[PDB]
Design a binder for this molecule. Structure first.
Ligand SMILES: Nc1nc2c(ncn2[C@@H]2O[C@H](COP(=O)(O)OP(=O)(O)OP(=O)(O)O)[C@@H](O)[C@H]2O)c(=O)[nH]1
Ligand SMILES: Nc1nc2c(ncn2[C@@H]2O[C@H](COP(=O)(O)OP(=O)(O)O)[C@@H](O)[C@H]2O)c(=O)[nH]1
Ligand SMILES: Nc1nc2c(ncn2[C@@H]2O[C@H](COP(=O)(O)OP(=O)(O)O)[C@@H](O)[C@H]2O)c(=O)[nH]1
Lengths: 114, 50, 41, 430, 12, 51, 48, 22, 431, 431
C-alpha cells in the first residue's frame, strides 16, 4: 500500500437498513451462490479487472465484476457488501476477502437467514 | 449439570494448559533451541533479525 | 518356473555367503590363538 | 511417558539411592516433603491428585537398619512406606542366604510392588538396578530379582549400576565369592552393566576434589551425578537426544559384552572452580583420562569398542564433534578395528545441578563418558584369581553350602567368568 | 448350494 | 440330524442329484440342507402361513 | 596431538579435507583474514 | 587361574566318573 | 496448482522440515498464525503448491510429520512456526527406534505406517494435481531412515508416476555421531536407489565447511545447517511457486538431470552465501553467482566434484536477469572445465530462470549436480559397512528385529553396483 | 405433516432418547419448559413431525418412555429436558428386568405392554399422517431389548404399512458390560429381523473409538455417546423437518437401502466430527465431509466396512452445497472403491440434500450404510451365544420365566441364516 502524503459506508450515502441487510438481499444471495459455484475461479473476473495486481478494486470495477457474474446486481448492494467486508476504507476493498466473506456467508435457502 | 461441566472444564483446561505451554515456549524462544540459529542475523540475507 | 529358479539361485548365494562368513570367523579364531601364543611365549 | 523404575538393593544400593533421590529432588525442585511449589519429573516421579510427587523407586534390603534410616531421615514423607521393604535377618554376606533361603519372600513382595509401580507407567524405558556385587543382600537378592524381572517383564532394558570389589582394598572376605556368583547371575539378565569401584572413586575424590578423608556419602554423590547425567536426556530436551534403548544399540556390540566403565568430568571442588576455562575439548579429554574412570582399570591396556558421551549444559554439537575428532586422533586412545565410528554423542541443555553441602562446584558443562572397552577384562581377571585362591582350599564354602548351594554352582560360575574372559579377548583381538 | 446349478440331465 | 426347523416338518424331498435336501415345515420356511456340509445353505421365507 | 590439540585446527580444517582455516584480523569490519592452507603430513614444495 | 580352570575340569570328570559308576 | 506433499522423518528430518516451512512461510508472507501478511500478489498466486486454505484465511503446510518418539515433535510444535501445521498430520509412536533401521522399518514402523499412509493419502487426494512428494530425513538414524524408506516404498507403490524427491542427510565422512550410521545408511541407500526418483545427498560436515569457509560463522548450531538445507529446498521448487522467464518444474529437472534411472543421486549448493564483512564488497552478478556455485566448497555434499565428472547439472536462478548472460556464463563454465564434464553429452547444463529472488537477496541461484564424485562417498560408507559386517558387530540388534542377514549383503551388493555404474560413466569414452 | 412416534426402551434407550430430544429441541429452538425461542420460521414450519402443541404455546415431544424400573425414568425427569415429556407417556413397572430378555418379553413385559400400546395408539391416532415409529434401545439388556421387541411386534401387527425404525445399541465386541448380553442380543435379533423394517446398529466401543480418535476427548461419559447417537438420529429425519434441494423421507431411504427384506440392518455415522483443537484446522468442504464419512473410523458400528461389501449406502447432506459436487463425490467414491461395492447394483449410493444445516455447523452429512460387514458382528454374537448355550449357563433364568429352550435355538438359527444371506450377497457375482 503506497504512502499518501472518510468511511466507505459514509461515502455513497449507504443507509443503516442497507448495511444491515447487505448480505440478506436476494441479489446478494444470488451473487454468493454464483461465487460459490465458481470455486477458485470466483476471483478470476476481479483479477482480470484489476490492472495493477494490487488486490484492491474500486466501486465501479467491482460493480462491473458483480454484473458480469449476475446481471441483476445494482451498485448499492455491492457497495453495502464492500462496507460490511471492510468497515473503514477509502474504497479499494480486497476482492479476495470480499469473495471469501460472501461465500462464507452464503445461504442455501433464500427464506432462511434473510 | 455440575458433573458434566466439571468434566468438560477439566478437559478444556488441560488442553488450554498445553496450548499455553507451547505458546510460551514459542514466544520466549527457549523452545526449539535445537533448531535456533547461532548468530542473530539472518545467514542467507545477511540481515539482522527483528 | 523362472521365479523359482531365481529363488533357488538366491538361496545358493546365501549358502555361499554363510560359508564364507564361517570361514572368516574360523580365520579370526586362528589369528587370535596365534597372537595369544606369541604373547605368552 | 518416559518412566524409569529405580531399584536399590542392599546397603550400597540404598545409600547410593539416598544421594540419587536427593539429587533428583534438587534437580526437579521437589521438596523432601514430597511436593514442589513441564512434566519432566514423570521419568522419576509419579504425581498424585494432592500435588505430591512420589518416586517410582523400590528400596529392598534384608537388613532393617538401613531402610529405617531412610524412614527416619529427611526423606520420610517422600517415599512410599510400602515401597520401603525391609527384611528381618541380614544376608550376612552370603549369596546363598540372599538367593535361596531368606530372599524368596522378600523378592516375591518386591515383584509385587514393582508390578504396582509398572502398572502406573504409560511408557517404560526400563529398570535402574543399583546393588553391590560383593554382598549377600546385593548379590543374591539382586540376582534373584533380576532373574524374575527377565522372566516376567521380558525385553525391558535393565541397567545394573553395580559396585564391584576393588583390586587390592576391600571390606569383606567372601567378597570375591559372592562377586563371582553375582557376575555369573547377571551376565545373562542385565542389559547394560556399569562397573564401579570404591578404590577408583576414592582416588577421584582424593586427587580432584582434594578430599583426604573420602566417605560413602561422597562416593554416592558422585555416582548419583553420573546416573543423573545418564538419564538427563529422558527428562530435559537438547540437541542429539539419546534414549535408554539407544544405549544398548549404540553401545553393546555383542550380548555377552555389556559391562561398561564410567567417567564423569569435570570433578572440581568449589575452591578451585572458575580458575580454568573448562571448555568442551578439555572436559572430553578429562573424561577420557585413565585416572578419571570410576573403575580401577587402565584403559590403555585394552581397546575401546564404543564410547557414549552425555554432555550437559552449554555444549554445541560442533564442539563435541571437534572434541571427539581430537580424541580419535589421540594415539593413547586405541579403538577396535571393526568399529570405525565407536562414538555416540548426546547433548542436553540442562547443566548438572549441584547439591548444596556437596563438594562438586557449579560447572556449566559436564561430560559422562560410558564406554564398552575390552580393558574391563582386567578386573574380571583379578576377581578370577581372588576367588580361586580361596576356592582351592574351599574356604568359607560350607557357609554357602549351608543355605542351599553346591560345589557345582561355584564351578559353573567360575567357568562362566573364564568364558567371559575368553570372549573379551576374542572381541578385543582382530 | 453345493451343486444346485447343473445342466438339465436325464429329461426322461 | 438337522435341527434348525423348530416345528413339524410337513414335507421333505431330495434333489434329483441328491446333494441337497429340501425341508418344508410348519416354521413357514423352506430350508435347503447341503448333505456334504450338513448345514442349511438357504432358508426360503415369504409364506405367511405354514408350508 | 603433538602438533596441537586444537579443536579448530584438528576438525574445521580437516572437513572436506580442505585443510585450510580462516583467521580474521579483527571484526567483520576489518574483513581481512588468513588462510593457513596447511596440509598435515606433507612438506610444502617450497621447503621440500 | 589355569590351575583352577583345570581343577574345575577335574571335578567335572570326577562327577562324570561317579555317575558312570552309578 | 501442481501440489507437493512434504514429509519429515526422524529427528533431523523433522527439524529440517520445520526450518524449511519457516523459510517458505517467510517467503510467502505467512505469519506463524497462518494469516497472509506478505503484501505481494505473486506470493499468494501459487501458495496452493504447499499450503491449503482453512475456514479462515489460515494457510497450513501440506506436511506430514513422522516419528516414533514424541519429544522431537513436541519441540517442533514449540518452535517458532510450530502451530501452522495441521495437528492431524503429526504421526508419532511411543518408543523410538534406538538408531535401529530394523526397528524403524520392520517392527515398530509396521504399525504406524498404516496411519502414515492414511495421512499421506488424505493429503494427496485433496490435491487438484500432484507434482509429487518430498521427504526430508537423515540416513544413519533409526526412525528417520527406516520409516522414510518404508514410506517411500509405499508411496512408490501407490503413486508410481508421481514425482519422488528426497533430501537425505547422509552420515558425515570424518566425524560420525552414532555407531550404527554405516548400517542404517547402507540399508537405506538400497531402498532409495530402487524407489526414490530424485535424491539430494547432504552432509553435516559439508554444511559445517560451508558455514566456516563461505559464511565464516563461529559456533554455528544445527539451526544454521537446517537453514541452508531449507534454502536449497525452497530454491529447487521456486519455479513452481513463482513466474519464471524460463521455468522448470521438478519433473523437468529430473528429466534433464537423470541420464539413466539408477543415477539419480545429486549434490546441491546455494548461492550467494557470503560472510557479513564482505557483503557490501561482493559484486552481485551472474558471473559471480556461477563462480560461486561451481566451486567445490559451495557444495553441501562432502564429495568434491574435482575427483569426479559432471554427468549433468541444473542451475535454477532467481532474479530479474539476462538469459543470455546466464547461458553464456554456464557455457563458458563447460568450455573451461571440459575435463570435469562428460564427453558423450553435448550440453551438461540445464538452465532455469525464475523472476522472483528470495527475500532479502538481490539475486540467488541453486545448483543440483549429478556427478560421479558421489562415488567416493558411497565407497567410504561401504568401507565402514564392510568393516563392521566382517565381524558382525551390532548385527544382533538388527537380527533380533526379524530381518535376515541376507538383506545386509543384498544392500551392500546394490550399493557397490551403483558405485560401479558411477565409475563406468566416469571413464566412459565417446564412440 | 408426516409424524413420527418416538419410543424409548430400557435405561440406555431412555438416556439416548432424552439426549435426542434435547438435541432436537435445541435444533428447533425449544426450551425445556416447552416454549419456542428460536426466532426462525423454518424451525416452527415442520415442528409437528416430532412435537404436539399444548393448550398454550407449549410444544411436547411425541415420545413414549418404557421401563420396568422407575429409577431410570426418575433420572429422565431429572435430566435437562425431563419436563417436556407428558407425565402420561411414562410407562413404568415396579420390578426391573434383571437383564433378562425372558422377563422383559414374557413375564413382566406382558402386563405393562397394555399401557405401552394404549399410549402408542393414543399418540398415533392424533397424528394427521404417520410416517412411522422410531424405537431407541439397547440390545443386551432385559427390559430394553425384550420389552422393546415385544412392542415392536405389537406395533407391526397393528400398523403393518407404517414405517418401523430401530436404533439398537448392540453389545460391544471387546468389552462387554453384562454377562447375558449374547443371550439378550440373540433373542432380540430374531425379533428385529422379522418385525423391524429398518434398523441401525450402534456399539459403545465404536463410539468410544470415534470420540477418542476423531473428537480427541479424554474422559467421554455416556452423555457424549448419547450426543453422537442423537446427532445421527436427528440427521436421519432432518429431510422431513426441513426443506431440501433433494429431499428423501424414511421410506425413500429404506427403499433405496434395502435390496431384500431381511437385509435391513444398517451401520451409521455422522460428519463433521472435528476435534476441538483442529476445528480451525479443518476446512468445511463437501470432499472433506465425504472423506470423513466413508472412513471406517467414523462408523459408529464395530464392524469395519473394509472386510465386507457395501450393498447400499445413503448419504443425507445438510447445508449450502452443490448437488453436482455431492453427486460427483459419491460417484468418484464408488469408482475409487469399486472393490468394496456390490457389482450387481449399478449405483450403490442414495444421495439426499437438505437446505438446513445443524446449528453452528455450516455443513453436515449423516451416513447410513447397508453392508455385508455386519456379518462379522452377528458372527461374533453367535460365537458367544453358542459357547454359553453349549453348557447352558444362565439358561435356567430364562427357563424359569416360561421360555422354552427351543426358542434360543430358533433365534440362533434365524441369526445364522441372516449371516448366510449376508455372505451370499457379499460373494454374489453378476451374471
Ligand atoms: N560405593 C559404595 N559402596 C558401598 C556403600 N555402602 C556399602 N558399599 C559396598 O557394599 C558392600 C556390601 O553391601 P551389602 O550387601 O548391601 O551389605 P548389607 O546391607 O549388610 O547386606 P549383606 O552384607 O549382603 O548381608 C560392601 O562390600 C561395600 O563395599 C556405599 O555407600 N558406596
Ligand atoms: N542438519 C541437521 N542434522 C541433524 C539434526 N539433528 C540430527 N542430525 C543428524 O542426523 C543424524 C541422524 O539422526 P536422526 O535420524 O534424526 O535420529 P532419529 O530421528 O532418532 O532416527 C544424526 O547423526 C545427527 O548428526 C538437525 O537438526 N540438523
Ligand atoms: N450409549 C449409552 N449406552 C448405555 C447407557 N446406559 C447404559 N448403556 C449400555 O446399554 C447396555 C444395556 O443396558 P440396558 O439396556 O439399559 O439395561 P436395561 O435397561 O435393564 O434393559 C449396557 O451394556 C450399557 O453399556 C447410556 O446412557 N448411553
Amino acid at each position: 500500500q503506497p504512502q499518501q502524503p472518510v468511511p466507505l459506508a459514509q461515502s455513497l450515502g449507504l443507509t443503516q437498513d442497507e448495511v444491515a441487510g447487505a448480505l440478506s438481499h436476494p441479489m446478494v444471495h444470488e451473487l454468493a451462490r454464483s461465487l460459490y459455484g465458481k470455486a477458485s475461479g470466483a476471483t478470476s473476473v476481479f483479477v482480470r479487472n484489476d490492472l495493477t495486481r494490487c488486490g484492491q478494486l474500486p466501486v465501479r470495477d467491482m460493480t462491473r465484476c458483480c454484473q458480469a457474474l449476475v446481471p441483476g446486481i445494482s451498485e448499492r448492494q455491492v457497495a453495502a457488501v464492500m462496507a460490511v467486508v471492510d468497515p473503514n476504507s477509502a474504497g479499494g476493498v480486497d476482492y479476495r476477502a470480499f469473495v471469501q466473506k460472501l461465500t462464507e456467508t452464503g445461504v442455501a435457502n433464500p427464506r432462511m437467514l434473510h | 449439570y455440575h458433573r458434566e461441566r466439571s468434566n468438560w472444564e477439566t478437559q478444556a483446561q488441560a488442553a488450554a494448559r498445553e496450548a499455553a505451554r507451547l505458546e510460551a515456549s514459542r514466544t520466549t524462544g527457549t523452545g526449539a533451541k535445537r533448531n535456533q540459529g547461532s548468530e542473530s542475523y539472518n545467514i542467507i540475507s545477511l540481515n539482522y533479525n527483528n | 518356473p523362472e521365479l523359482e529358479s531365481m529363488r533357488e539361485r538366491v538361496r545358493q548365494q546365501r549358502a555361499i555367503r554363510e560359508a564364507q562368513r564361517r570361514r572368516d570367523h574360523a580365520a579370526l579364531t586362528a589369528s587370535i590363538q596365534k597372537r595369544n601364543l606369541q604373547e605368552e611365549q | 511417558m518416559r518412566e524409569v523404575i529405580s531399584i536399590h538393593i542392599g546397603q550400597a544400593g540404598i545409600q547410593v539411592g539416598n544421594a540419587c533421590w536427593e539429587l533428583y529432588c534438587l534437580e526437579h525442585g521437589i521438596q523432601p516433603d514430597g511436593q514442589m511449589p513441564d512434566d519432566a519429573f514423570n521419568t522419576f516421579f509419579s504425581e498424585t491428585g494432592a500435588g505430591k510427587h512420589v518416586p517410582r523407586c523400590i528400596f529392598l534390603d534384608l537388613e532393617p537398619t538401613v531402610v529405617d534410616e531412610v524412614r527416619t531421615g529427611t526423606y520420610r514423607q517422600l517415599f512410599h512406606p510400602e515401597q520401603l521393604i525391609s527384611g528381618k535377618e541380614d544376608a550376612a554376606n552370603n549369596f546363598a542366604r540372599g538367593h535361596y533361603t531368606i530372599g524368596k519372600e522378600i523378592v516375591d513382595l518386591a515383584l509385587d510392588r514393582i508390578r504396582k509401580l509398572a502398572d502406573n507407567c504409560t511408557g517404560l524405558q526400563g529398570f535402574l538396578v543399583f546393588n553391590a556385587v560383593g554382598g549377600g543382600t546385593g548379590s543374591g537378592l539382586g540376582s534373584l530379582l533380576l532373574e524374575r524381572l527377565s522372566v516376567d517383564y521380558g525385553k525391558k532394558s535393565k541397567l545394573g549400576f553395580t559396585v564391584y570389589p576393588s583390586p587390592q582394598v576391600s571390606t569383606a572376605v567372601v567378597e570375591p565369592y559372592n562377586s563371582v556368583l553375582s557376575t555369573h547371575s547377571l551376565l545373562e539378565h542385565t542389559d547394560v552393566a556399569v562397573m564401579l569401584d570404591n578404590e577408583a572413586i576414592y582416588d577421584i575424590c582424593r586427587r580432584s576434589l582434594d578430599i583426604e578423608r573420602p566417605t560413602y556419602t561422597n562416593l554416592n554423590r558422585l555416582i548419583a551425578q553420573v546416573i543423573s547425567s545418564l538419564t538427563a536426556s529422558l527428562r530435559f530436551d537438547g540437541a542429539l537426544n539419546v534414549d535408554i534403548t539407544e544405549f544398548q544399540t549404540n553401545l553393546v556390540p555383542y550380548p555377552r559384552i555389556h559391562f561398561m566403565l564410567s567417567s564423569y568430568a569435570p570433578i572440581i571442588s568449589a575452591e578451585k572452580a572458575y580458575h580454568e576455562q573448562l571448555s568442551v575439548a578439555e572436559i572430553t579429554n578429562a573424561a577420557f583420562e585413565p585416572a578419571s574412570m570410576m573403575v580401577k582399570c587402565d584403559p590403555r591396556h585394552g581397546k575401546y569398542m564404543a564410547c557414549c558421551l552425555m554432555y550437559r549444559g552449554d555444549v554445541v554439537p560442533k564442539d563435541v564433534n571437534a572434541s571427539v575428532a581430537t580424541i580419535k586422533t589421540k594415539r593413547t586412545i586405541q579403538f577396535v578395528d571393526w568399529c570405525p565410528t565407536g562414538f555416540k554423542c548426546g547433548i542436553n541443555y540442562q547443566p548438572p545441578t549441584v547439591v548444596p553441602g556437596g563438594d562438586l562446584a557449579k560447572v556449566q558443562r559436564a561430560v559422562c563418558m560410558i564406554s564398552n572397552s575390552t580393558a574391563i577384562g582386567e578386573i574380571f581377571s583379578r576377581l578370577d584369581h581372588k576367588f580361586d585362591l580361596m576356592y582351592a582350599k574351599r574356604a568359607f564354602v560350607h557357609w554357602y553350602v549351608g543355605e542351599g548351594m553346591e560345589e557345582g554352582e561355584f564351578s559353573e560360575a567360575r567357568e562362566d567368568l573364564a568364558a567371559l574372559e575368553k570372549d573379551f579377548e576374542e572381541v578385543g583381538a582382530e | 448350494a453345493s451343486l444346485n446349478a447343473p445342466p438339465r440331465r436325464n429329461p426322461y | 440330524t438337522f435341527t434348525d426347523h423348530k416345528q413339524a416338518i410337513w414335507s421333505v424331498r431330495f434333489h434329483h442329484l441328491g446333494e441337497v435336501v429340501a425341508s418344508g415345515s410348519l416354521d413357514h420356511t423352506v430350508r435347503l440342507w447341503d448333505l456334504p456340509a450338513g448345514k442349511c445353505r438357504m432358508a426360503l421365507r415369504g409364506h405367511v402361513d405354514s408350508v | 596431538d603433538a602438533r596441537g590439540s586444537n579443536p579448530d585446527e584438528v576438525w574445521t580444517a580437516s572437513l572436506r579435507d580442505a585443510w585450510e582455516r580462516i583467521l580474521p584480523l579483527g571484526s567483520i569490519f576489518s574483513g581481512l583474514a588468513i588462510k593457513i592452507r596447511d596440509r598435515p603430513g606433507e612438506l610444502p614444495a617450497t621447503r621440500a | 587361574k589355569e590351575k583352577m580352570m583345570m581343577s574345575l575340569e577335574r571335578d567335572k570328570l570326577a562327577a562324570r566318573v561317579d555317575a558312570l559308576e552309578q | 496448482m501442481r501440489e507437493i506433499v512434504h514429509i519429515q522423518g526422524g529427528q533431523c528430518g523433522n527439524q529440517i522440515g520445520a526450518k524449511f516451512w519457516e523459510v517458505v512461510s517467510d517467503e510467502h508472507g505467512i505469519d506463524p498464525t497462518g494469516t497472509y501478511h506478505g503484501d505481494s500478489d505473486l506470493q499468494l498466486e501459487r501458495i496452493n503448491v504447499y499450503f491449503n486454505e482453512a475456514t479462515g484465511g489460515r494457510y497450513v503446510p501440506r506436511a506430514i510429520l513422522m516419528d516414533l518418539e514424541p519429544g522431537t515433535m513436541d519441540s517442533v510444535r514449540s518452535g517458532p512456526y510450530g502451530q501452522i501445521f495441521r495437528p492431524d498430520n503429526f504421526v508419532f509412536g511411543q518408543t523410538g527406534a534406538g538408531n535401529n533401521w530394523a526397528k524403524g522399518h520392520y517392527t515398530e514402523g509396521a504399525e504406524l505406517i498404516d496411519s502414515v499412509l492414511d495421512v499421506v493419502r488424505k493429503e494427496a487426494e485433496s490435491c487438484d494435481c500432484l507434482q509429487g512428494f518430498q521427504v526430508c530425513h537423515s540416513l544413519g538414524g533409526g526412525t528417520g531412515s527406516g520409516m522414510g524408506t518404508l514410506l517411500i516404498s509405499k508411496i512408490r507403490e501407490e503413486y508410481p508416476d508421481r514425482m519422488m524427491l528426497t533430501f537425505s542427510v547422509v552420515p558425515s565422512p570424518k566425524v560420525s555421531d552414532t555407531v550404527v550410521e554405516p548400517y542404517n545408511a547402507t540399508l537405506s541407500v538400497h531402498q532409495l536407489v530402487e524407489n526414490a526418483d530424485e535424491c539430494m545427498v547432504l552432509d553435516n560436515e559439508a554444511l559445517y565447511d560451508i558455514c566456516f569457509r563461505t559464511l565464516k560463522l563461529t559456533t554455528p548450531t544445527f539451526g544454521d545447517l537446517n537453514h541452508l538445507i531449507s534454502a536449497v529446498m525452497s530454491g529447487i521448487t521456486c519455479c513452481l511457486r513463482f513466474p519464471g522467464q524460463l521455468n522448470a518444474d521438478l519433473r523437468k529437472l529430473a528429466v534433464n538431470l537423470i541420464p539413466f534411472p539408477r543415477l539419480h543421486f545429486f549434490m546441491v549448493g546455494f548461492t550467494p552465501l557470503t560472510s557479513r564483512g564482505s557483503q557490501q564488497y561482493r559484486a552481485l552478478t551472474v558471473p559471480e553467482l556461477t563462480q560461486q556455485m561451481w566451486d567445490a566448497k559451495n557444495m553441501m555434499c562432502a564429495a568434491d566434484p574435482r575427483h569426479g565428472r559432471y554427468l549433468t547439472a541444473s542451475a535454477l536462478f532467481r532474479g530479474r536477469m539476462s538469459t543470455k548472460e546466464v547461458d553464456e556464463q554456464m557455457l563458458n563454465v563447460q568450455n573451461k572445465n571440459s575435463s570435469y564434464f562428460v564427453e558423450w553429452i553435448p550440453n551438461n547444463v540445464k538452465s532455469s530462470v525464475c523472476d522472483i529472488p528470495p527475500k532479502g537477496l538481490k539475486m540467488s541461484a541453486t545448483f543440483i549436480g549429478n556427478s560421479t564424485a558421489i562415488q567416493e562417498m558411497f565407497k567410504r560408507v561401504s568401507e565402514q559397512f564392510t568393516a563392521m559386517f566382517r565381524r558382525k558387530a551390532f548385527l544382533h540388534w538388527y537380527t533380533g528385529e526379524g530381518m535376515d542377514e541376507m538383506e545386509f549383503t543384498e544392500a551392500e551388493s546394490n550399493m557397490n553396483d551403483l558405485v560401479s555404474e558411477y565409475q563406468q560413466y566416469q571413464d566412459a569414452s565417446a564412440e
